[PDB]
Amino acid sequence: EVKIVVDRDPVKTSFEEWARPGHFSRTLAKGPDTTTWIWNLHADAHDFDSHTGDLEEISRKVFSAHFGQLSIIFLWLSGMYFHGARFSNYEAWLSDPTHIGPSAQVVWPIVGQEILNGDVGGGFRGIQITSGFFQLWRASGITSELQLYCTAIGALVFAALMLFAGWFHYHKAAPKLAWFQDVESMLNHHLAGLLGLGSLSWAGHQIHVSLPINQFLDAGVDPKEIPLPHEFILNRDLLAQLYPSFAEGATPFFTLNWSKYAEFLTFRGGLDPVTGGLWLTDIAHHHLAIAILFLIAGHMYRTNWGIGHGLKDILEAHKGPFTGQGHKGLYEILTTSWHAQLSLNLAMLGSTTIVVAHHMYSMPPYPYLATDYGTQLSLFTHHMWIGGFLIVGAAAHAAIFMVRDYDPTTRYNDLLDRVLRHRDAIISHLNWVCIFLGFHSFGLYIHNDTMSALGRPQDMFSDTAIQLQPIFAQWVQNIHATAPGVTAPGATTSTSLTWGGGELVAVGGKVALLPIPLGTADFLVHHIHAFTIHVTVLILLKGVLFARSSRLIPDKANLGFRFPCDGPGRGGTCQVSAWDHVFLGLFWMYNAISVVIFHFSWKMQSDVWGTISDQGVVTHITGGNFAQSSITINGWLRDFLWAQASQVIQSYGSSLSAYGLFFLGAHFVWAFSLMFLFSGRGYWQELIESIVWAHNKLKVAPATQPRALSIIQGRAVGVTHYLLGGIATTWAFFLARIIAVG
């Protein structure tokens, strides 16, 4: 059945191994042969799979390790709440959120660096933040420095709880294997307990605290006089003075007269004109609706009583003619291998983060988030990068599974077999498309640029010339605009304001949203994204399929997951290891994402954001030039890189100086990485030797013999810096630009 059998004191808490570096691995433990040793110490620190050969210990280590990862997050949260309480103009920000920048960092004045303390207003100074906590603390009705302090302590305590918990469950009472593999109950609790009861509890706090309090601040009152949140929960008559449905108590909920709670549980849609965010009634309803759906879904898989499904039997009924044995056997290979689960989870959590970034800019959920141009740009950019990386990780661990855990004599699967057998078709067809999109997406930009350069602006691809109208997006925009009429009679308005119809929402002389048009200039760039996404898929997919064998090397599996090459024979076999396919994917992931966050930044400044006249005419930040200048490659140079880098470049001598330095500093690191990617090891090894000789002359030759980095480390350092230089350069480019213009 399903029970809790654990062990007692597997590994004794002691400090011995803390003074025996490289104890975990048998190879590393003998000592530092050369400096190659101190690099292999960290490269194999967390690879629990290579230390031991059984699933039980690997499990207990990953289970306890997560507790550490969970603990750090709490400590990270604790600082953010603490800092917002002791070093912020939050309470001032609650008075005029429209035109006082959120600041929650203050620097010590040592070497003149107090120039960084910007005049964010509100009688305060400091680094203007952009993570947008302030809109999060207002949407939860905090309205006090004291309440930000107590949660900071509460957040800190849990960190000690988690960190303690990690210790307890690896040294004192560690679970057994049978505990881990019972994945029906695993899903059963997470769906009902974590996901389900998480929302319902939160839908609680919104009903009794965030809603009635924020309804005071939105109504307009000084924060200091809002009765404390435990007054409503005690004095039930106060909730009556706003929400008369709270007189009858919770009995309508029990008599199915649910249309009595219509005051604070609605289906409005749209955005709030006062605060530019969603209607907290909808949000209040939303988590409640989600709560029920998850909770019921929790009760599906059989755990201990008669009722419930069997995850094994579900996978063993779907087998088709084209597919053969179908999903039989996938239960094992998804249960006796952590690298399978980590690869599968990474892709979904990777994808979801992206969808988060597409929704949070079009349905602004927190109050006074819409007119916070510094926040919108950062939050959209941040989760794109997070979403991009995690997807690449799903390729690496899927590739690792093919090399280490896959075995067609015991863990045999049929679908994963058929997929292997026709892999030549899969890559070649994906190869042709990546070429097709390559010619018809970039080429149109090149042809546009050539014709424009020759004085033929009537042969370019644009709205004023040969036209390419996205109709399919223009059609679906139409449908969502008229959905409130027929196909969703409950809704008062559309689910957003970017649908091809409606009206803008103005908050304090700053546009929240308005219908986003889709002309030709948008059609091209959407087919750029379809191109770089496909190419990135090609590299990672090729790595996963060919991680065990190919027509070049027939025994690549025997060489492991990350090996440099197989020598210069057969024409040259540099970079055939699956690790080097993900190594290549990173650049395209860095390429796909970068154009997306360029596309978002220009489209919103040119077509959406911007001030609004008192009369009613709207003037966007860049004057609406995206629809004409974004179709020529030179256009992306003049009017985006050259014209929107002005603020970062001349940011010297004012609080935005720290961005001016990072802008340069990130170039230096980017250009630095090239030394590792372009060159090779055998040159650096020899130059090291001559340097080593001079130290022999003066007797200062070390005993950990100097060595050059290993082949796959020269690449690993090469890509890491390149990514760090590329991402940070955009970081300093964006924040300094948007903070100055809005």
């Binding site: 803390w18 003074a19 040592i110």
Partner: protein, 42 residues
Amino acid sequence: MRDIKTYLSVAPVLSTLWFGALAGLLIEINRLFPDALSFPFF
């Protein structure tokens, strides 16, 4: 007790302790003799 001291003697832990002390010292001197473009004693 011996094992704790040995661990505290491994290279990375000394580095942060050593450099941290060095950072504190330089910051203090710049707090007391700031701008310091020349050495005007002799």
